[PDB]
Amino acid sequence: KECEKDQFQCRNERCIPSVWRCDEDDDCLDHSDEDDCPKKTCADSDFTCDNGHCIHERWKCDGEEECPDGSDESEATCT
Ligand SMILES: [Ca+2]
Ligand SMILES: [Ca+2]
DSSP: OOOOTTEEEOTTOOEEEGGGTTSSSOOSSSSGGGSSOOOSSOOSSEEEOTTSOEEEGGGTTSSSOOSTTOTTSOTTTOO
């Protein structure tokens, strides 16, 4: 059995909307839609821009705005 490309397949093989994957409610009844869910946020090793965009730490404060809000280059950010 294989679900639509817009679906998550539970271990019991129920299909759910993929939008229900990792939404912190067990829709599968086997909890499989909520297993091994990615970290909600950036890598701790990445710089998190103010707006939440993730960039690699190396590009923090190096003259070019890799953050869309430019917070990797802000006065505040670089001390
Ligand atoms: Ca869910
Ligand atoms: Ca930069």
